[PDB]
Design a protein around this ligand. Sequence first.
Ligand SMILES: *C/C=C1/C(=C/c2[nH]c(/C=C3[NH+]=C(/C=C4\NC(=O)C(C=C)=C4C)C(C)=C\3CCC(=O)O)c(CCC(=O)O)c2C)NC(=O)[C@H]1C
Ligand SMILES: *C/C=C1/C(=C/c2[nH]c(/C=C3[NH+]=C(/C=C4\NC(=O)C(C=C)=C4C)C(C)=C\3CCC(=O)O)c(CCC(=O)O)c2C)NC(=O)[C@H]1C
Lengths: 313, 315
Amino acid sequence: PFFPPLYLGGPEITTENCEREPIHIPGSIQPHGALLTADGHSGEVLQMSLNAATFLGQEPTVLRGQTLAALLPEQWPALQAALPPGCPDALQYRATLDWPAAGHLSLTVHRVGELLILEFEPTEAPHALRNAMFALESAPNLRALAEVATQTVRELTGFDRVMLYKFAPDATGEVIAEARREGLHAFLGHRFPASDIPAQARALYTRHLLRLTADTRAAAVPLDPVLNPQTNAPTPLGGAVLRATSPMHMQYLRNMGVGSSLSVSVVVGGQLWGLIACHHQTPYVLPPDLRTTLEYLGRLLSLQVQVKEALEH
Amino acid sequence: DPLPFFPPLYLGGPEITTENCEREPIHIPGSIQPHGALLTADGHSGEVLQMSLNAATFLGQEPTVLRGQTLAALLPEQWPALQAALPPGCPDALQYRATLDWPAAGHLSLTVHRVGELLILEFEPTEPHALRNAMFALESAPNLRALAEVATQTVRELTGFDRVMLYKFAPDATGEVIAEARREGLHAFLGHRFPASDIPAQARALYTRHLLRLTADTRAAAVPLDPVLNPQTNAPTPLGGAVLRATSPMHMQYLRNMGVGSSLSVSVVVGGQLWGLIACHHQTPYVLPPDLRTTLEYLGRLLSLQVQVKEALEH
Ligand SMILES: *C/C=C1/C(=C/c2[nH]c(/C=C3[NH+]=C(/C=C4\NC(=O)C(C=C)=C4C)C(C)=C\3CCC(=O)O)c(CCC(=O)O)c2C)NC(=O)[C@H]1C
Ligand SMILES: *C/C=C1/C(=C/c2[nH]c(/C=C3[NH+]=C(/C=C4\NC(=O)C(C=C)=C4C)C(C)=C\3CCC(=O)O)c(CCC(=O)O)c2C)NC(=O)[C@H]1C
């Protein structure tokens, strides 16, 4: 099963109980964005991140009464149609708001049962993706495909280190390709134990295909209330990219000297084949539109891995 | 019966009838569609060899001036990028794309690929979260039918085409329309089936390697290359990989007879085989700009993946 989260007086995690930390329900988010939850029917704002006032520019109480209808007039009917009752928690809808306080915000919404989860992040506003797609497809074998993928991602993102991290049948991981800035340790060829990415992290990554820690030293921002009014239970945040990273994994990243981390799942035959894993030495908020490019690349790599593995077997 | 290609018309080959369809050499027509321009150049020196006859009007230069310069001089910023992206021996399927600001012609999209020692350069005029939203909707579709319907509707919304169909090949190469989105008033093709020869075997082979082809105006005359043969080889210039390549006149007649002014299909490739086509129709001529066509190319790949996934959920 899972332990209760901390804020419901559950045990603190150790290396004895890696597998039982409820990472999906941390009750908090990373501070480079803001999150609101809301009722599926009424559009009634039920929870907000204590930092919402910053991003939205709204007097705190104003929000926690109001309706999405009021708050987002153009958007609220689109949401209603895009995310019908009963849809999967994996389905997401995005829009760009030109919002008074903040030039442009990206809005990302998904639905978990009766709750809409809304994420707001700063945003903005060429051929590198098309060029990359053809490059991946003409790679002659899996090894070269891995090399092209890591190089392409590094060029698109500027990340200090990009790896392709492949799982063995026992969930031992191996770095099979790597693109990195001069003057970093090489992780190429290294294998790591399955517990470094515990089973409950791997399952969540099979369904929700991108996560990140924008700053490995930033404090999480609580949800208020912490419990969903609807259920008097924790809000599931696993489909939210803003979700606070596990403090165990933040300790892991700091001990490696990483300041920013991001990864994309490569899913083949319904299973987690591996990860595009990225490191930056310093804090780094990759903007939403560039993340989208990596999300596309994730799908394309999933296709090409199967194609390429089929021409060996 | 499968038989080798006839020589093209310009090398004294025969004219093509319903009798000998499968033998038209549709990859070497010696000509392009008039809404863009094409140059060929030597892959090592960058000497310009062939050009479409309309090139002066896209590129704003006399032929003899174009042909008298190397790509190093014509494309000083792109020439080194081309050479890195398209190394000798690379496959003909690999494409490099850039946007140019050309004085006379505005923003041009440049698409380049390499066939042996030849570079092929295509120039076309070029111009929010719809793709991301579509990607997730496709993935959440519960079964093959719902996927097919979401895919057709999405493509129609992105493009404005009068008719978008998902055409699926059977094992005997007969096809069947299995989903479609269509303009009000058009008659339905859903559930209809068409003989295997409607798309002969040399077209299906090409359609497994080069995943997007089109006919922007089914009444437009083709524009010859000049000279027609590659001076490197005194042989035909391979245009299989060029979206500007002229469509088979057999096929343009089949389209005009249907009332179609514009056609475009994306290949859906599963396990190395052509599974089906996203086929689109417009009643009037219609040019879809290169950046919009890129969205369809990306959806072609997504759909190939999702078709595998939906079919595996099915035994
Ligand atoms: C008691 C449990 C421990 C634990 C937990 C844990 N680990 C993750 C997630 C990740 N761990 C990763 C590991 C590596 N990254 C590398 O670069 C290398 C090798 C050079 C390794 C071995 C990775 C890539 C992830 C994914 C997330 C990311 O990209 O940063 C989680 C989940 C975190 C979250 O999503 O909130 C958890 C709980 N890690 C341990 O080492 C043990 C002690
Ligand atoms: C004597 C040969 C004939 C022939 C040749 C031919 N056909 C193609 C390509 C295509 N034919 C298609 C047929 C259909 N379009 C539809 O909308 C339907 C059903 C409602 C069918 C059956 C299609 C879709 C294509 C693909 C290209 C496109 O999307 O337009 C070629 C190759 C063309 C080229 O690449 O230049 C050739 C030679 N078709 C016949 O019917 C016989 C008479």
